[PDB]
Amino acid sequence: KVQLKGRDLLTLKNFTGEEIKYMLWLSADLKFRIKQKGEYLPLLQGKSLGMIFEKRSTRTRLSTETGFALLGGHPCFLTTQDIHLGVNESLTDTARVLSSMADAVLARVYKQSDLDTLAKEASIPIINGLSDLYHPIQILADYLTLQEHYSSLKGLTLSWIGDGNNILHSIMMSAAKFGMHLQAATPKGYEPDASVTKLAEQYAKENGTKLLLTNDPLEAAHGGNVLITDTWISMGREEEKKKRLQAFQGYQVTMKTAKVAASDWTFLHCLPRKPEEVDDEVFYSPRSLVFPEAENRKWTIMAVMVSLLTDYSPQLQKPKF
Amino acid sequence: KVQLKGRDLLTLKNFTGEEIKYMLWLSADLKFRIKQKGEYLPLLQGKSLGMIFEKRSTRTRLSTETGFALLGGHPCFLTTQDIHLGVNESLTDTARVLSSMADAVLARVYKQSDLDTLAKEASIPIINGLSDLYHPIQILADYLTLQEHYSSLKGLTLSWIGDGNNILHSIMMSAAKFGMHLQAATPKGYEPDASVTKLAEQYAKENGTKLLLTNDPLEAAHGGNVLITDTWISMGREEEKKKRLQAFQGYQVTMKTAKVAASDWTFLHCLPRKPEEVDDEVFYSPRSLVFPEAENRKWTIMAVMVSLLTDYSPQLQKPKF
Amino acid sequence: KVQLKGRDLLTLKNFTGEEIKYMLWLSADLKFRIKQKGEYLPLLQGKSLGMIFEKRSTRTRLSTETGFALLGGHPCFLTTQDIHLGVNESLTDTARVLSSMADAVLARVYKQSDLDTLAKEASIPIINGLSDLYHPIQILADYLTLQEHYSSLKGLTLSWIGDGNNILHSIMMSAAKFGMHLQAATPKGYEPDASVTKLAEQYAKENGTKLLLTNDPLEAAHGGNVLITDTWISMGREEEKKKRLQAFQGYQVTMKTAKVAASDWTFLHCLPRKPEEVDDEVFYSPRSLVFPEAENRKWTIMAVMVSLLTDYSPQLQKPKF
Ligand SMILES: CCC[C@H](N)C(=O)O
Ligand SMILES: CCC[C@H](N)C(=O)O
Ligand SMILES: CCC[C@H](N)C(=O)O
């Protein structure tokens, strides 16, 4: 049914519900075999990964590097300071050299269009490691964490409070494909991309789910099963700190926020977390799935790499979504 | 008898003579099997190490990275410039993410208290890769090198001449547990930490060894079997270069120093070495064990990682200490 | 016949035609077994490589790191910012520590004399990863690419147009040993090193090949089978940009250049490429072997490491040179 080998993964907008579910199935399979059964599975033996990072990273860096190596492959960490890209060489040429020396590329960038150039010019899989526009592999870890917590996903309401950024765009490109509703609050002027919203509206209609965009945190939180936030000042946006601290007043997730949420509410934050978006009482709550979520960045990028580079079939029974 | 799996290694003060001897036994075992018998021993297969470095490193970096990989594990080199730590994220949160993505952490830091926070907040082993206060894994290599040279350790007198720094603190936290005496000379005002000295005095009493602190290089060198020094200006102390070059005049180790030492004297320096602390005649002497010492950083960090992460038992006969 | 194990590879001037042919034979063997037959060949299992880079690199970095790891070894990427070299430690001492912790070193430097110090002071193989004077491992990839394209090398004329730099010096140290002629055009004042030219003249005489140095691009291109260029402003020469852009006017390789070349002409450029030295019509021509050339950096550095560190014999039939 699903065929993912050789594909790029630039955004979850290019993937069906069935395809994203397959990647979560594979994540759960690799997690069960390796973390629980202690198996060594050299699925990426004799393969290598080029990791280009234009921005700081703790989770994406660590999960990708230890995950690729745990399956027997070699991860090569490449920064702007060490390679010729931008400085002495074009992206087209860098993309062709990477194609002949590595089996895939994970690139954390500013411009999504750089990932498109890389995908068009390389004949190997290009995986988005975060861009200004989308962060698809984060949402993989998020939905796996919620499937593990709730034992299914269909009908959950996700409540975003915060900026209309890359994380919210990736939730918008995927939530409805799992039959989940989305209620999202951002400050006025900080809404998600109009083009992304338009396509999320279509997905909601196709899947019979609700999509609500608002500027009120408590309207977004009302009846939500999952409260989700992120930093108000994303990487590359630090010049706007003053204006954003003023615009985002009233948007911190607290227990007041949770008081309005469904009784089984949990909390997610992609991390790194600052004190502004969420207080400590929620962040370190027993309902906070923040550190399980961060661990699942590893099992899900492992599943991405296995499905884009091999013909491995999951032995695990498919999870209930 | 000895049980080290799961422990942290922040300082040798937390380890008994028996425990540190076990780590040297394991170092000798892994050195014999791999360097001499040429065996491939994948003891850390399917494991990973997070290496956080806040300071420059050639020996700790290389020994840890090639040693962890030689046992089949994957080392991930993380600097301040690339990860979010300090900048966008707290140490508590970084410690919890590292716990779920790696099997241990080696961290070279400024503040020893950062290693304590890391050890309390992570559920995986934290190994000190050097701090301003201690450098325990260096002394492991030092005592293995001296056991190899002398065929035992008990009753040796170590003569430190130089600064009251992290290397001298690690010798103070361990020498007496091996039945070795310590005679150490520092400039006035540059003495070892009062708290460390107090605990070294107790260890000397418990083990019936001598501890002598002095400001005279020749009193420290008198009758010593091993002359030991290090840079007068440690990393993070470069603002004090002028004051230290003036305070440390007369503290260079030369053949005049060795003339007063025991007849079988040898020399150690943790490296990197500068011309100030020791002259070339001693540093490149046939009695200088500096490069054997630096090689043993690899076999001993391999033994640290194996004992904190596995249940491997040494096949080698225990060395005479 | 050929015995290369334990040798350094600082320049192709120290290698006979037979020895360089053996390295190309081994490159073709490892390429056939791994790229075509899909074999996993752990020839460097239990080995490590220290990679010291003083300059930016995409191809040398990637080919060396993924190639060393593809054969089961561990590559350790060391920059000036992270290790003590230059700053707190001498090259002699760094060379001795690297000898006891790694099995070989690849070093991309400014000064060729730093590679000589490293080779004299270390007891492990030192491989040149590019210096201001030579880039031997690039020419290995170049001649393998041309052997694959033409099915032999003897009698080919290589036509260099550009600067008298490290790439042209490596061609001068090797072309005649394969029975290939060299016609090279540089601007006046930008000629190859007098000492290198003198030795290339001797090699041409010993092998009965022609060597022509000129300042005219079309004289160099006339009847040449391979047009070769590189940047006019090498790394470390950016202060001379103004003077070089003026001196090199008229030296861009275009189809006018190729109109004068042999009918079977191809094009090489070591990369990174800029618009100045060659136009797009030649660079992206079907006759341009630029990206095959860049891929062969990987199979040839793999062969270098295997021949300097093991006793592996090629199973492949020797290529026709
Ligand atoms: C993982 C960090 C996500 C955040 N929105 C950013 O782009 O900085
Ligand atoms: C390994 C270097 C040791 C020195 N005391 C320092 O802290 O810089
Ligand atoms: C691989 C780059 C070669 C160029 N001549 C340089 O030295 O910068």
Description:
The structure is a homotrimer of 321-residue chains. By secondary structure, the first copy, chain A, is of the alpha/beta class. Chain A folds into two domains: 153 residues, 3-Layer(aba) Sandwich (Rossmann fold), CATH 3.40.50; 159 residues, Aspartate/ornithine carbamoyltransferase (Rossmann fold, 3-Layer(aba) Sandwich). In chain A, 40% of the residues lie in helices and 13% in strands. Chain A has twelve helices and nine strands. In chain A, the strands form two sheets. Chain A has a five-stranded parallel β-sheet with strand order 7-6-5-8-9. In chain A, helix 4 links the parallel strand 3 and strand 4. In chain A, helix 1 crosses helix 12, helix 3 packs across helix 4 and helix 5 crosses helix 12. The first copy, chain A, is globular. Chains A and B meet through helix 2 and helix 12 of A and strand 2 and helix 3 of B. The complex binds norvaline (NVA) (3 copies). One norvaline binds next to helix 6 of chain B. Chains A, B, C: It catalyses: carbamoyl phosphate + L-ornithine = L-citrulline + phosphate + H(+). Chains A, B, C: Pathway: Nitrogen metabolism; urea cycle; L-citrulline from L-ornithine and carbamoyl phosphate: step 1/1.
